[PDB]
Amino acid sequence: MQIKTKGDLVRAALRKLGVASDATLTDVEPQSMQDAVDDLEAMMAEWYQDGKGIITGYVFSDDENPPAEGDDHGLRSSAVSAVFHNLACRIAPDYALEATAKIIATAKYGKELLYKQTAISRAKRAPYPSRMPTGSGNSFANLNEWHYFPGE
Amino acid sequence: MQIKTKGDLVRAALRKLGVASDATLTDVEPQSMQDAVDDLEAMMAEWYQDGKGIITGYVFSDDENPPAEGDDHGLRSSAVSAVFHNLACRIAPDYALEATAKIIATAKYGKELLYKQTAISRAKRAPYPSRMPTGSGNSFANLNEWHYFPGE
Amino acid sequence: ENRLESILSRFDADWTASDEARREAKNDLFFSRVSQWDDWLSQYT
Amino acid sequence: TTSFSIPDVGLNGIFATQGDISTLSGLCRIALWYGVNATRPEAIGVGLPGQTA
């Protein structure tokens, strides 16, 4: 993948919006780029709700290493499109824009695909209640006096 | 996070609105900053209904400190986007503007994510009523004469 | 060669042999005589 | 309150329990009242070995 930093994600988002690309004769300011990186950090932090949200592998920058741009985002290869399409949707209003229908649809699809595997992982069944017997067909448990399920 | 202060929140809101950013060559007006900070404090106090509303970790500035701007808001890393999107929505009518559909949708989503964990925490089940027995299967209680649940 | 050793060998053999039916019988006695909620091993909070 | 026999030694104390106003709890108190008196100190003795240095 040719998108390997937070600024790379931001550049992909701007190109997707059609504001700035490698072919355009006019470009956006580095301050606007840093603002877009702040937006990206905020969006990913709101997704990853301290571990109880969308798990992606994103790495949050620290103040010790100064530029958040330039840091590898750490996403797997299949989260980049979702991340930068959602980023384009989020940062469109700054430039008096409105993301096109295709961008919005790809953002929805990408976010759902991002959360699919985590949803499958969290679809877990609870253990038996503490008041449920283990039956008598469980000869080992009933010989060891496990007449009722442990629970918890 | 690069958004550490109430002024950072306010500048992000004004940039979302497209009033004072770098994508558009506008500087934040010092008259606009104080009005936006006052609106932020009013909206935060409204949300945090003396502890019975949305808990976010925001820190309300007292009358003692000279600058209400410059102080860390104290939010978590996953509340910044919600707060400043809602703030942009709230202060858009100051300038006879209207936050666009993406901004309104992100404000709704962010506020819901703000309240989600608190809703889970407050989803508590009331104890057994005072007239409910313990049952004879609770041998220790029914031996020590605790035939009924206390309640309350 | 020891009287106690032979006696205890016989007792240990018989106890181990009868260990299953005895356990089931005492469980039946407790179930029908003390309480049918015989869940002393389940850790409830 | 019931009686409570201290084993080995020949003494009897009380064992009292009372529950709480609520919350399905309790309190237990095992109490024993006594006093050890030496009526004949001249008949009690002590042996101290290695009393050098």
Side-chain angles (χ1 to χ4, degrees):
Chain A
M1 51 145 169
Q2 295 290 296
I3 299 153
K4 306 191 244 234
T5 47
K6 311 191 194 316
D8 264 287
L9 290 170
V10 169
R11 274 181 281 271
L14 291 170
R15 176 195 81 233
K16 195 43 42 173
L17 286 174
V19 161
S21 171
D22 256 19
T24 64
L25 313 164
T26 89
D27 206 318
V28 313
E29 275 265 295
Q31 164 67 242
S32 284
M33 285 285 270
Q34 158 176 321
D35 271 19
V37 175
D38 282 344
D39 274 46
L40 165 69
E41 293 279 293
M43 151 180 127
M44 221 65 58
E46 147 168 303
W47 285 7
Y48 178 85
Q49 293 274 325
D50 300 2
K52 329 196 78 71
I54 305 192
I55 274 74
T56 38
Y58 194 77
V59 185
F60 296 87
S61 36
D62 44 354
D63 317 288
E64 177 252 308
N65 213 260
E69 160 55 335
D71 276 12
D72 321 62
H73 43 51
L75 306 157
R76 26 189 180 79
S77 211
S78 55
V80 181
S81 46
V83 157
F84 88 74
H85 274 103
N86 272 276
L87 190 49
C89 262
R90 276 245 187 155
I91 74 195
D94 304 30
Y95 311 87
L97 261 53
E98 170 72 52
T100 196
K102 180 61 195 203
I103 285 176
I104 304 175
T106 323
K108 293 151 56 48
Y109 176 63
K111 200 157 129 56
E112 211 214 23
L113 264 200
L114 259 183
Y115 193 68
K116 173 181 291 180
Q117 303 284 330
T118 313
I120 276 171
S121 187
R122 304 201 221 241
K124 221 176 317 287
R125 227 194 213 294
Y128 278 93
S130 211
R131 300 190 272 184
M132 172 79 187
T134 82
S136 52
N138 297 280
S139 41
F140 194 61
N142 288 43
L143 280 193
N144 286 287
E145 286 322 295
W146 269 107
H147 300 303
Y148 286 63
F149 273 103
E152 188 222 330
Chain B
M1 45 178 189
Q2 287 275 293
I3 304 202
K4 305 131 142 51
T5 37
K6 307 194 202 320
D8 288 4
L9 282 189
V10 167
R11 287 199 274 275
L14 300 174
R15 171 180 50 102
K16 294 332 310 193
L17 278 179
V19 158
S21 61
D22 209 340
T24 70
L25 304 137
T26 325
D27 301 329
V28 281
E29 313 194 319
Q31 282 104 343
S32 281
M33 178 82 38
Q34 200 203 19
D35 300 347
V37 162
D38 279 3
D39 268 16
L40 161 68
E41 296 271 280
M43 142 177 146
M44 270 326 178
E46 155 150 296
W47 285 11
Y48 181 81
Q49 295 273 326
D50 290 321
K52 290 160 167 25
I54 309 178
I55 282 87
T56 45
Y58 185 99
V59 202
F60 307 93
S61 38
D62 44 24
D63 306 275
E64 200 211 341
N65 204 235
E69 170 30 30
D71 296 307
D72 303 358
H73 43 46
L75 305 154
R76 20 187 174 82
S77 210
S78 51
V80 177
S81 157
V83 174
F84 81 67
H85 276 102
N86 276 265
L87 183 50
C89 278
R90 278 246 187 159
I91 75 198
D94 274 43
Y95 321 79
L97 285 191
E98 177 72 46
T100 177
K102 182 58 197 207
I103 296 181
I104 307 166
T106 325
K108 291 158 57 47
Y109 175 80
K111 213 182 138 169
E112 211 197 24
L113 284 204
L114 282 183
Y115 196 67
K116 169 184 291 176
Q117 287 308 308
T118 319
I120 278 171
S121 154
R122 284 181 221 201
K124 272 199 306 313
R125 218 194 231 286
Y128 282 89
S130 44
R131 283 181 285 179
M132 181 85 218
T134 36
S136 34
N138 293 298
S139 35
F140 188 59
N142 288 63
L143 277 194
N144 285 44
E145 306 167 40
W146 284 310
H147 307 133
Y148 287 77
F149 283 114
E152 178 203 272
Chain C
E1 209 276 321
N2 206 4
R3 183 86 177 95
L4 176 94
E5 291 302 327
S6 78
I7 285 174
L8 285 193
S9 287
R10 283 179 241 154
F11 164 71
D12 293 326
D14 313 339
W15 184 272
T16 279
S18 64
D19 208 18
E20 266 64 38
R22 165 184 327 122
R23 277 196 278 201
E24 295 190 65
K26 326 210 323 277
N27 182 28
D28 283 7
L29 276 199
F30 181 89
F31 183 87
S32 48
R33 251 165 167 116
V34 177
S35 86
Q36 320 182 313
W37 279 87
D38 52 18
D39 60 351
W40 59 86
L41 271 184
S42 316
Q43 298 293 308
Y44 70 77
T45 166
Chain D
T1 301
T2 77
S3 196
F4 189 78
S5 147
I6 303 312
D8 215 46
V9 299
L11 296 152
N12 207 243
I14 68 137
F15 173 45
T17 85
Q18 88 163 9
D20 297 82
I21 194 193
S22 47
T23 200
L24 231 53
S25 307
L27 284 169
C28 261
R29 178 135 152 192
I30 295 152
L32 179 63
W33 207 6
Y34 68 99
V36 172
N37 282 273
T39 51
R40 309 183 40 204
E42 81 265 349
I44 310 184
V46 152
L48 296 171
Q51 282 325 299
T52 183

